[PDB]
């Protein structure tokens, strides 16, 4: 499975007349567990993020003037919300405390609206002291006119 | 389940939400050691504070035997009770203390002080000696209470 990659790279390299390389990695029993700590970090903030633009959607969809799709068969109105994250703006608020494992929530939660149509500029990032703050500072921004949705990471537990 | 520290961490939360302020509420954490300490120190402002607690309520008693006035009754029964109220408004008091020991007799002091002027006693009535041991208590302590500006006595020894 990893041999034929590299064959067929070698013979891309002979036909086009260009030096492309091709490399993988050895992984002992401890890389492992820490790529395994960190996908599994990322996989959360990715499944945050996406529960909340998916809640946006549905806000959007459900005070709007035009029924969707019904049931299995029909004469059941059913209102759900897609991932779509094009024009909404949205505000995370982390903790320093453990940065070094926030910032890792924070990174896969920003590309994942990124990825589903968002762009960076409606993104507001607000750090707070600890775990304690973050109510009152979500409160803050969602004070603001401006904002669709609210993603919190903390630390603890 | 204590039905203390949670009530307390409620209402403040409540209020900081409530108020748009921030309230840092923290609290202590001891073990086995620091709660010792802890208790010794209370115990020692406990000893100086009824020390001078007693004699707020002789004086007041000593007031009220010797005077002309028409004490009230236990319950309506005319059998009238003479009794020391704890309102120390205008008398005058004297502490002594040793200056021996006196990282505990100062707490001890401070324990009296801080209990005359709560009652209502004014801070330029109260008047400090310190003596270097308990051995010079006597004769400073006679001549405080010699002093017909003086209602009560306090003295601090050592141990």
Not at 86 to 92: P, S
Request: with cysteine.
């Amino acid at each position: 499975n990893a041999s034929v990659v590299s064959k067929g790279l070698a013979n891309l390299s002979l036909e086009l007349r260009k030096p492309v390389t091709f490399d993988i990695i050895t992984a002992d029993t401890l890389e492992q567990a820490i790529e395994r700590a960190g996908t599994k970090h990322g996989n959360k903030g990715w499944e945050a993020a996406l529960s909340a633009i998916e809640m946006a959607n549905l806000y959007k969809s459900l005070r709007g003037t035009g029924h969707h799709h019904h049931h299995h068969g029909s004469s059941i109105e059913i209102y759900e919300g897609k991932l779509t994250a094009e024009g909404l703006r949205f505000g995370i608020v982390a903790s320093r405390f453990n940065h070094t494992l926030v910032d890792r929530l924070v990174e896969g939660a920003i590309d994942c609206i990124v990825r589903h149509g968002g762009r960076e500029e409606d993104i507001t990032l607000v750090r707070v002291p600890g775990s304690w703050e973050i109510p009152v500072a979500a409160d803050e921004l969602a004070r603001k006119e401006d904002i669709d949705a609210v993603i919190a990471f903390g630390d603890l537990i």
